[PDB]
Design a protein around this ligand. Sequence first.
Ligand SMILES: CC[C@H](CO)Nc1ccc2ncc(-c3ccc4n[nH]cc4c3)n2n1
Ligand code: NA
Length: 328
Amino acid sequence: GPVPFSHCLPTEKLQRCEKIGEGVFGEVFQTIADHTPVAIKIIAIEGPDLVNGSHQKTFEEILPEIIISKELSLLSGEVCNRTEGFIGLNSVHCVQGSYPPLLLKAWDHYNSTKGSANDRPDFFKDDQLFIVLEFEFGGIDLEQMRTKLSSLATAKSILHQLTASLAVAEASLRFEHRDLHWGNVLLKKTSLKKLHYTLNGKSSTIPSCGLQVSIIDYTLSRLERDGIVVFCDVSMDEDLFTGDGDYQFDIYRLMKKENNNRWGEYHPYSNVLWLHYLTDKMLKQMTFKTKCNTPAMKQIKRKIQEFHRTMLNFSSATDLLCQHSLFK
Ligand SMILES: CC[C@H](CO)Nc1ccc2ncc(-c3ccc4n[nH]cc4c3)n2n1
Ligand code: NA
């Protein structure tokens, strides 16, 4: 059945853990496994204590995220519909134990420097179960990089990458991400000048501007294979739809409007909505190292503004990728 935490996180691996993110689900750490950076997502399951304001999920309720993470990871190795724009999934374990004190130390450091919205995970007993997902390390989130991007050309690249990856997942998996806020877009440096994707057998390239994008966090995502749908049913969630103070919170309500609160259905317009929210962040909340004070860069800005203005008239990421003038 379950294994002890030390199976997944031997002493040296625990000693190198640094906390990088969080959500109601639990905690995300970066560490090193076999000289390789990885990200570890740790989710409490099956217990009766409140955790970050929700009850813990059952093993059955975590399976959708596991399945989705695996399907999107596989897309990097496929042929007809191929993208590296999600993130690799290396392993999944069920572990048992109280939270390691070294992880608490990392948690404390994050709380001291960035602040946490979570409860300190120090109340779990030695019989507590967790799911531990180990992912390829994907870089730094777009929000944390909001003052670090070179120019609007870099912004165009990121939007193109995101759109393409979403299109390929729509094509292969009838995928909707459903929570693609700017914390869920990771950026990593690449020396590749061009990145490659294949959509329904047709391969294309995207200029990288030195960055490779990875879309993460499939907690709210939906997909299907052979008529079998995997999703998070939020039809009875109150709080998800009553956020304020950021366009992000409007996106939840707009998705609910689009799907009539039926979350099992396929509505790839949700991917469009998130891309619109991301484009909006690109135009309003980023500080580029190079301003748009040359005619060439101005032109890119006008193109992104045109995208912002027109993209909500498209039906899916696939429609955007294949038809929108931004990508031509
Ligand atoms: C970078 C940390 C991020 C900042 O907004 N927060 C979260 C929060 C939820 C979440 N679920 C999965 C991942 C996840 C999955 C794979 C990863 N590879 N490299 C980093 C990864 C993170 N996250 N990350
Ligand atoms: Na990736």
